[PDB]
Amino acid sequence: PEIVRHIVFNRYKSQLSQKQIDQIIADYGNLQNIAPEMKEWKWGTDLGPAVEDRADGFTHAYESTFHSVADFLNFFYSPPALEFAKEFFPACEKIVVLNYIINE
């Protein structure tokens, strides 16, 4: 099994209310109840320069697991994912996304 990790770092645009940002994050997490392929969704906020100062302006991280590349692609091209991407990406001031096959 070639398990894929999907890790997103972002920074939200400064004009968005915290209410709007909370909603976007809730919507992201709720994709797991629509897309059976998306596993182990988690997120959090960077702890800041008291812990380490290499976040380069990124504030949030999101992690997802997929059990194959084929499962990831089916998810990524599904209508719910395409719809969510049109809300999520324009809300980002900064974004970076890596997809990788897990090595132990």
Residues contributing to the site for ligand MXN (CB under 6 A): 6, 8, 76, 81, 84-85, 88, 97
Q: How far apart are CA 94 and CA 59, in angstroms?
A: 9
Closest distance to its own copies from the beta carbon of 92 (Å): 10
Q: Tell me whether residue 2 or residue 89 sits nearer to ligand MXN (CB atom).
A: 89
Interaction pattern, residues 10-49, with its own copies; x per rule: CB under 8 A: -------------------x-----------xxxxxxx--
Is residue 31 within 8 A of residue 72, CB to CB? The reply is no
The single-letter DSSP state of residue 11 is E
